[PDB]
From a paper:
By using a combination of heavy atom and molecular-replacement-based phasing strategies, we determined multiple crystal structures for Xenopus (x) Rspo2Fu1–Fu2 (highest resolution 2.2 Å), xZNRF3ecto, zebrafish (z) ZNRF3ecto and mouse (m) ZNRF3ecto, (highest resolutions 2.4, 1.6 and 2.0 Å, respectively), plus complexes comprising xZNRF3ecto–xRspo2Fu1–Fu2, mZNRF3ecto–mRspo2Fu1–Fu2, mZNRF3ecto–xRspo2Fu1–Fu2 and xRNF4F3ecto–xRspo2Fu1–Fu2 (at 2.1, 2.8, 2.4 and 2.7 Å, respectively). The ZNRF3ecto crystal structures revealed a distinctive variant of the protease-associated domain topology. Two β-sheets (comprising β2, β1, β7, β3 and β4, β5, β6 strands, respectively) splay apart, accommodating an α-helix (αC) at the open edge; two additional α-helices (αA and αB) pack against the β4, β5 and β6 face of this distorted β-sandwich. A disulphide bridge, conserved across species, links two structurally elaborate loops, β3–β4 and β4–αA. The resultant single-domain structure is relatively compact. The crystal structures for apo xZNRF3ecto, zZNRF3ecto and mZNRF3ecto showed no major differences in the main chain conformation. Comparisons of ZNRF3ecto structures for proteins crystallized in several different crystal lattices, or for crystals containing multiple copies in the asymmetric unit, consistently highlighted an acidic region (N105-E114; residue numbering is for mouse sequences unless otherwise stated) within the β3–β4 loop, the short αC–β7 loop and the extended β1–β2 hairpin as flexible elements of the fold. All but two of these crystal structures reveal an extensive interface (average interface area 992±109 Å2) formed between two ZNRF3ecto polypeptide chains. The interaction is twofold symmetric; strands β3 and β7 of the ‘subunits’ abut face-to-face at the core of the dimer. The β1–β2 hairpin forms a second interface by reaching out to embrace helix αA and the β3–β4 loop in the opposing subunit.
Residue numbers in the entry:
A (entry chain B): 30 to 80, 88 to 181
B (entry chain A): 30 to 80, 87 to 181
The structure:
């Protein structure tokens, strides 16, 4: 099922009102996690960063070439789990560089997380990084329709 | 339609992890805002307080006054919802227990709906909501369309 991800940039206009810009993106809900909507501020994690942020962040993790990390500290599902335990309301992996991560997550072996675990690639990941990379405050609204 | 609201208390466990306690509550989405999901930190707002910056993305909770308490209200209850979004609310949850007439007003159809959810809660759920909000600091609201 498709995860409709809205990524919102924001600047507090001087008087308290917010100026925002929204970009709508898409990934899929993995079997590894729940298929629910979720939302919160984006934290960009390095994939090795998962071996205190305020509760309810949306982890964004750009996975790396499998041959960069030969004996990885955890499985990609393990990494997501650790994120949640550390207060993530959702995890979005950019699997552009680790396309086999997908089959690994959808392997349906452990029963799922109660939070979403979304995978993104191609154009949408590029845009997700285009935004994340440049702006401190960005918000993710992950929507199951 | 029903708004399925999970309120989550939380505090850090001594090792980086979070200990949490979750409470599932219900309200309805009103025609004044979308019927979508939304999540964020609760900010309890006095109803007269929509007439100081908050981190974008908060879920405002507003317990409405007995109508005879506010004779000259700065805004319609939809106006306060709308003002809250503009100040970075991701959703508004009104406790309507003391002002049941606000429901009919919120569902009026007259103005465009907000792109954010505007939920109302009453009776028991709202009690349970304020029970958590008034005591607990560090409360996250997850509002869910199913």
């Amino acid at each position: 099922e498709t995860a409709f991800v809205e990524v919102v940039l924001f600047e507090s206009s001087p008087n308290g009102d917010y100026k925002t810009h929204t970009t709508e993106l898409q990934g899929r809900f993995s079997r590894a996690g729940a298929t629910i909507s979720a939302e919160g501020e984006i934290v960009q994690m390095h994939p090795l960063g998962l071996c205190l942020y305020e509760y309810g962040w949306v982890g964004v993790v750009k996975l790396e070439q499998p041959e960069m990390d030969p004996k990885p500290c955890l499985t990609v599902l393990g990494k997501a789990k650790r994120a949640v335990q550390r207060g993530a309301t959702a995890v979005i992996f950019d699997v552009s560089d680790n396309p086999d991560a997908v089959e690994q997550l959808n392997q349906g072996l452990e029963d799922p997380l109660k939070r979403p675990v979304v995978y993104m690639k191609g154009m949408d990941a590029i845009k997700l990084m285009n935004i994340v990379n440049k702006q401190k405050g960005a918000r993710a609204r992950i929507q199951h329709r």
